[PDB]
Amino acid sequence: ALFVHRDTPKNNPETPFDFTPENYKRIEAIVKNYPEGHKAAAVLPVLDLAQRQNGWLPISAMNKVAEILQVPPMRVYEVATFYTMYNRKPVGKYHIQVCTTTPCMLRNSDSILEAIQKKLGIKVGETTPDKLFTLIEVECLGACVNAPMVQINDNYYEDLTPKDIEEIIDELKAGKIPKPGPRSGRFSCEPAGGLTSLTEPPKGPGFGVQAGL
């Protein structure tokens, strides 16, 4: 929750970080996406790649990203503290992100937050003592008609009730992986009482095309 750093014995500039060689080839592919002379444009994807490899960002992933892109380390520290996905503390293995903005709050995301809390025994911001779950409270995740919903490390679990999210936490404690979708009957975003549109077969190529084209 702090935006200054202090060198702890588990987070210091001599904490061992290095990319795997297949991640060096991934960083080559990332840096080739941007124009020559603008290698600093790959600060966000390579830092996300370092977080995906390591689970979180020590201050050696930031220094390695500054070392392999030839940018100042302060200009990587700015990006790492600005964006709210870069975990500068070690988070749990399943990082649960409950949305509590107004379209999810109106559809009772507080009951889901309370269900996750009394299932895990933690509160907002805490990590479980076995380092499996970190429950934080996030802003709008962009799945608003599927409210209420959480995100667990990559995956959107949508249309949730307390029973649905407790079943998800059960099968995440069981070592399995759940299916990322709406936990009600519907599939992605349609009206739940059947399709109110797009029931007819779509037309295909050549339909309605103007002349001379």
Partner: protein, 263 residues
Amino acid sequence: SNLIEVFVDGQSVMVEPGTTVLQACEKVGMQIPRFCYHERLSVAGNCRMCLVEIEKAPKVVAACAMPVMKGWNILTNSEKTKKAREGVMEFLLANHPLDCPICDQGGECDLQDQSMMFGSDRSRFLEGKRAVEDKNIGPLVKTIMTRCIQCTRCIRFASEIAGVDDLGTTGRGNDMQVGTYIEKMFMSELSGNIIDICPVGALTSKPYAFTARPWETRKTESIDVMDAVGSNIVVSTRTGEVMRILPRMHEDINEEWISDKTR
């Protein structure tokens, strides 16, 4: 030539293309209130104190960054220009600490002076203020980041003039903090000039700290001898004793900077 004509409060003035609104008002002798604009740094546009009305335009423009068009009438003393200035001064003083008596910037503060000139005279702020953790950047610059008004003259100085690239903003929103993010010791040869261009008491001189106060000092315009550049300096004395050294502007030598040995 290709000089275009702009009007500043009706007064006609011929400016070069690419001239900002602030420089157009300067050419008729009106100094627009600024906090993040500095004529030797890059333009930031992020304090919004220079907001001025152009007439027949339903929006104030940031005069430090806005290039003039032909035939603009700049209204530096209009009603909504003054409302913009009072609002921005209100937001700057919303979270600013009540530290003026214990502050070395008191009496020589931009925030005090153009709060007296352009701000309102009382507060509507009824909440708790933020308080920022203090940083440590060496034995020269006393750092009290609660007074920081986030104008980024730090960062533009250390980036473009000192060439160090080690100050920056961490965080986001009202919790945005200026610093090095680590326990780093900002020791340049020009590092004491961030005390000059900080408009507030956030970066003060640690050797000078608490000893004097600007209204009681005598300004003796003198010359550096610590090298062969010959930087023009002000030797401020108080009751027969030298208190600190400040630069003089001299465009051909030291433009308005001095080194840390000099300072």
